[PDB]
């Protein structure tokens, strides 16, 4: 049996979340602590691709998101909101055959699960805006 993408994405989120309290450590090493053999070969490869992509483009991703936050900057957001946005933005921009609504709706689920009462609505709004202006043109043709 194969590990679902949703479970793979959750491991990526957990690594992002845990890193916020261990900023002197490597995001990639934190992901490996989370990954184990209960995940299949592809899921571990996929989670690594996501974490590497987010880590290697973090400043670009953060600055991209920052343009949609008026004066309540990214650093002032909760750990959950900030990282769901980072994860979803990476997916919208670099994971080619995933429809925009799948990325946004599955990101909202993570926000509702671990965030506060307005987390889901907040991230849905920001991601709708980011997707409209930053998703590759081909993604709209899916
Ligand atoms: Ca279609």
Direct distance between the N- and C-terminal alpha carbons of the chain, in angstroms, rounded to an integer: 27
Give me the domain span that covers residue 93: 1-142
Residue 102 CA to ligand 1 center (angstroms) comes to: 11
What was the experiment behind these coordinates? X-ray
Angle at 22 between CA 32 and CA 37, to 5 degrees: 15
Residue 141 CA to ligand 1 center (angstroms) comes to: 7
Spatial CB neighbours of 1, under 8 Å, sequence gap ≥ 6: 40
- Please tell me the distance from the alpha carbon of residue 43 to that of residue 40, in angstroms, as a whole number: 5
- Please tell me the distance from the alpha carbon of residue 108 to that of residue 120, in angstroms, as a whole number: 5
Residue 51 CA to ligand 1 center (angstroms) comes to: 27
How many C-beta neighbours within 10 Å does residue 31 have? Answer: 23
Residue 101 CA to ligand 1 center (angstroms) comes to: 11
Residue 142 CA to ligand 1 center (angstroms) comes to: 4
- Please tell me the distance from the alpha carbon of residue 2 to that of residue 121, in angstroms, as a whole number: 31
Number of domains in the chain: 1
CATH number at residue 135: 1.10.940.10
């Amino acid at each position: 049996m194969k590990t679902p993408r949703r479970r793979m994405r959750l491991a990526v989120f957990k690594a992002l979340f845990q890193h916020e309290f261990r900023r002197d450590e490597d995001l990639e090493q934190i992901l490996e602590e989370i990954l184990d053999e209960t995940y299949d070969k592809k899921a571990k490869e996929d989670a690594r691709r996501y974490i590497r992509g987010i880590k290697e483009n973090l400043s670009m991703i953060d600055d991209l998101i920052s343009r949609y936050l008026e004066k309540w900057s990214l650093n002032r957001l909760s750990v959950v909101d900030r990282n769901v946005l980072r994860l979803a933005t990476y997916e919208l921009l670099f994971e080619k055959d995933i429809p925009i609504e799948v990325t946004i709706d599955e990101a909202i689920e993570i926000a509702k699960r671990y965030g506060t009462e307005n987390s889901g609505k907040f991230v849905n709004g920001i991601l709708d805006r980011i997707a409209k202006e930053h998703a590759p043109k081909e993604k709209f043709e899916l």
